[PDB]
Design a binder for this molecule. Structure first.
Ligand SMILES: [Fe+3]
Length: 186
């Protein structure tokens, strides 16, 4: 029985219910995330930027089965092409716009990775990826506006792979946190 989250806090409570069992209903989770209307005051605490690259800010640790974070993207900031370590990944825009470029898993052969597609994710939209769908890059292409996104990962994971667009070669990356619960974590 899915209800609209009134606030980020409400959203988080609802996520604990949704993940109360062993199986994830992806469409339900995506629906509730989308239904949350971004309110900058509610997440300002987590929206910590860095001048040179995008940041990952932990919001909620979940119930063992997921966690929830906020990512902050300066003008021109973006990610590698990457996977998500056999986890569900939900991405919702809270401010600005992000360009998401989808790539297929590379064949064993060293080849240029060619874009399957791209789309512009706009404020409040929720996108979903998992490894069975493919790989992606996410970028703030704006010259004038920062972007902020809300991400849900299930199960949680702290490692992933980055892919070189020229070759498809991957490298294992350990992902870090800029902050946890509003507290900067050097
Ligand atoms: Fe990603």
């Amino acid at each position: 029985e899915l209800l609209k989250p009134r606030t980020l806090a409400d959203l988080i409570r609802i996520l604990h219910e949704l993940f109360a069992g062993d199986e994830v209903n992806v469409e339900e989770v995506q629906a509730v995330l989308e239904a949350y209307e971004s309110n900058p005051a509610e997440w300002a605490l987590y929206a910590k930027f860095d001048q040179y690259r995008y940041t990952r800010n932990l919001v909620d640790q979940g119930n063992g089965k997921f966690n929830l974070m906020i990512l902050c993207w300066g003008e021109g900031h973006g990610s590698s092409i990457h996977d998500h370590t056999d986890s569900h990944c939900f991405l919702k825009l809270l401010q600005g716009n992000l360009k998401e470029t989808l790539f297929d898993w590379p064949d064993k052969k060293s080849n240029e990775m060619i874009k399957k597609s791209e789309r512009t994710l706009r404020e409040n939209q929720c996108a979903y990826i998992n490894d069975s769908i493919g790989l992606h890059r996410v970028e703030n292409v704006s010259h004038t506006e920062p972007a902020v996104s809300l991400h849900l990962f299930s199960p949680p994971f702290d490692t992933c792979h980055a892919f070189d667009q020229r070759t498809g070669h991957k490298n294992k990356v350990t992902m870090t946190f800029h902050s946890k619960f509003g507290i900067r974590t050097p």
